[PDB]
Design a protein around this ligand. Structure first.
Ligand SMILES: Cc1c(Cl)ccc2c(/C=C3\NC(=O)N(Cc4ccc(F)c(F)c4)C3=O)c[nH]c12
Ligand SMILES: Cc1c(Cl)ccc2c(/C=C3\NC(=O)N(Cc4ccc(F)c(F)c4)C3=O)c[nH]c12
Lengths: 82, 82
């Protein structure tokens, strides 16, 4: 089981998660939710996430990532779920 | 506002919608959910919706569409709303 730190719960909750303990599938569904509802992906680079000045970005530290290559976010997730 | 038809009413509900009437975009937005959660998009081709055999397929009439060129179910709402 995974209890994230506040900041990511923050993206997390904000995509309608509830609570503190979680799974990794679950942590991946809400971050997807978030990107989809925040509509953060690129209308023309459909796999590219643009989260400049957006709290994901904050948490990832990049302004962009590709989902076709998800590493930098794993290193977010490798970093953030206790 | 729009009265979605059962077979599209089928698909909305599958991604946790409820009711009989919905706006365009909540609607636009459940399809969004159906597709995300069911992984209808191709992981390499992310703007690409691989849906044959799925309810969505035939209701689109099809086996995919380009989420860049949505006219099939922009067309499939227009005949399935309301
Ligand atoms: C990378 C990534 C993550 Cl993580 C999460 C969501 C997305 C994503 C989402 C969408 N692209 C799109 O065009 N729509 C609107 C849409 C809805 C239903 C239709 F049937 C339809 F044709 C069009 C989207 O929801 C594109 N990349 C993503
Ligand atoms: C076209 C279209 C429609 Cl219509 C609806 C949804 C999508 C879509 C969604 C995803 N692609 C992806 O790789 N994930 C996983 C994911 C989870 C958490 C993250 F943080 C993340 F970066 C990536 C997705 O959820 C990609 N194209 C779509």
């Amino acid at each position: 089981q995974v209890r994230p730190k506040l900041p990511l719960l923050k993206i997390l909750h904000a995509a309608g998660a509830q609570g503190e303990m979680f799974t990794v599938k679950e942590v991946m569904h809400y971050l997807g939710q978030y990107i989809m509802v925040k509509q953060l992906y690129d209308q023309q680079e459909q796999h590219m996430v643009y989260c400049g000045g957006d709290l994901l970005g904050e948490l990832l530290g990049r302004q962009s990532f590709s989902v076709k290559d998800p590493s930098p976010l794993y290193d977010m997730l490798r970093k953030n779920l206790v």
